[PDB]
Design a binder for this molecule. Structure first.
Ligand code: HY6
Ligand code: ZN
Length: 255
């Protein structure tokens, strides 16, 4: 198969006599294919930065092993050369400390696999706007990828209402350094949706939240380049293209 870097892929597999699905010694969780009962699903993601050229998964069954080969494609992401080498930058310890802590808090949350569906049918776009800045917009020195846009930015003046893309449980609901006023929702199966740079947070941590229910107001917090919404999806342990994901997810889980 072929998968563009920074995208997710729903794998279909026979349920009967299935034992495990592996990427070398790392396990990959599985879940019910909701319409077809003889099948199960797993989410596989390739990182945008530094993906392997090829990947080989193994679906072990009681009676046989089934291999899956996935070729890593490059896609057609927008990309600009960097003038100045990125290098190490030297923030104050006070900030270093905050970042490093908020990172730990994030990694703990994103490696807390919920093995049931908390969602309710398809995802909807968090607001009825348009994309100002695409996912995957990269900045490169020597065609090595230094950074990229980990989400997608919608047009939103400060105070534009934002709605949960799908049902779930709120895991983050506070101001953070890079993300500004962040909200992150666990939808189950390692699928998290992200809403950043809010001007206002209207939810707590631990709160069960309905699809289309209000989670906050768009803003510009922690954002250099003005008011907007930054929407993100983490799935199969990686930041991925949110619209591409939504479209694949919905194709399967449509109400
Ligand atoms: N979920 S998390 O581990 O806290 C995280 C993911 C991605 C980013 C990346 C970012 O902040 N991009 C900002 C931006 O340019 N918006 O227009 C931060 C934080
Ligand atoms: Zn953004």
């Amino acid at each position: 198969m072929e998968l563009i870097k920074g995208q997710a892929l729903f794998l279909e597999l026979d349920k009967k006599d299935f034992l495990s699905l592996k990427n070398n010694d790392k396990n990959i969780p599985t879940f019910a294919h909701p319409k077809n009962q003889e099948k199960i699903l797993a989410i596989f993601s390739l990182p945008y930065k530094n993906p392997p050229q090829n990947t080989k998964l193994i679906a072990f069954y009681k009676d046989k092993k089934e291999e899956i080969f996935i070729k890593t494609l490059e896609g057609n992401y927008k990309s600009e050369k960097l003038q100045v080498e990125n290098k190490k930058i030297f923030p104050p310890k006070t900030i270093q400390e905050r970042i490093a802590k908020e990172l730990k808090e994030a990694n703990a949350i994103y490696s807390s696999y919920t093995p049931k569906a908390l969602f309710n049918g398809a995802f909807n776009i968090p607001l009825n706007s348009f994309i100002t800045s695409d996912f995957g917009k990269a900045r490169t020195f020597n065609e090595k990828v230094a950074s990229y846009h980990s989400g997608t930015d919608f047009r939103a003046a400060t105070g534009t209402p934002i709605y949960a893309a799908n049902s779930g449980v709120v895991k983050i609901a506070k101001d953070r350094y890079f993300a500004g006023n962040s909200v992150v929702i666990d939808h189950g199966f390692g699928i998290y949706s992200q809403y950043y740079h809010l001007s206002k947070i209207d939810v707590k941590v631990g709160q069960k939240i309905k699809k289309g229910e209000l989670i906050g107001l768009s803003g510009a917090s922690g954002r250099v380049s003005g008011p907007a919404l930054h929407f993100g999806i983490l799935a199969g342990g990686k930041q991925v293209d949110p619209l591409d994901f939504v479209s694949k997810f919905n194709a399967i889980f449509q109400l």
